[PDB]
Structures are given as C-alpha cells and as structure tokens.
Amino acid sequence: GVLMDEGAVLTLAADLSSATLDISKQWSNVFNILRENDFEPKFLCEVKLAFKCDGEIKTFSDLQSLRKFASQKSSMKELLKDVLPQKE
Amino acid sequence: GVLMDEGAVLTLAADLSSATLDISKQWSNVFNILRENDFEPKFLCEVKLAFKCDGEIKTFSDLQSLRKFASQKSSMKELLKDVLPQKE
DSSP states (O other): OOOOOOOOOOOOOTTTTSOOOOOOOOOSOOSHHHHHTTOOOOOOOOOOEEEEETTEEEEESOHHHHHHHHHHOTTGGGTGGGTSOOOO | OOOOOOOOOOOOOBTTTBOOOOOOOOOSOOSHHHHHTTOOOOOOSOOOEEEEETTEEEEESOHHHHHHHHTTOHHHHHHHTTTSOOOO
C-alpha cells in the first residue's frame, strides 16, 4: 500500500572481485543521533592499522597482508605469533 | 643501520574516483597485540552504520549517502535535522 521501498543492491567482493580498502572521507558526526536514540549503530570495519613501526607509520587494511610483514619482522614475529604461525 | 625498504605505494580516491566501501572479511583478533605493545593502531575508519531503522537493519558505510536517506525518511528527518539542513 504505502511504503518507501528500496530495491536490491549487489555487494562488491574485496578479495574475490577487486581489492578494496577503506579511506576516511567522512567527518566527526558518526552515528551520534543513532546512539542517543538507540538505533544500535555499528562500529566494526576493516580498520587500516596506521601504527608506528620503525619510525614510519604503516597502513594495513588486511591482517593477511600484515601477516607477511609481521613474519619477516624480527621484533613483531613474537607479537602476532599467537594468531600467525611463526618460528623460522 | 640497514633494515627493510619497500616499493612505491599509492592511495585510492575516496569516492572521487571510485566509491570507497567497507566490507568485513576479517575475524576476531582486531589489532589486539599492536595495542598491547603500544604501536598505537587506528580505529577511525569508514564504518557501516548497521542499525535498526523502521524495522529493517540498514547498512550505511557512507554517511553522505545516509544524508540522502534520512532526508526522505520523515522518521530520521527528525533525528538528523539537528546536524543536517532541514527546512521541513
């Protein structure tokens, strides 16, 4: 009868179709109103770990990619060891 | 000292060249070890607002696109009218 209906939008595959990552194009007001009115907003995404390593900031949007880095990192080798098999 | 150089890495235009959208293919361990070792991991990324709106769960990874939604949504028009320009 009366409804504002949306159709069906396909999903893009980040590993299967084309390598896709995140980059901030948004601003400071994030789900604030939704948090107050309890719309139960989300907050889980493929965060790119922009962390400080050896003097430079790294950006990893994939732990699989970070695995390749952490493994050959003598220091980080003993850090990610718990989720990534080490010992070379 | 000698260490580990890399090649040449570039970035992607956020929505300017192609739509930047987040899709979770990661698992449970979210940069935990990096935090415990104080590499200072990130967290600020383009998250999808997977919230309950009008009975259905919506996913908005781009709040710009959400502005297009809440403007036609009378319900959310009364929520976001405080931050978004509403003449209605």
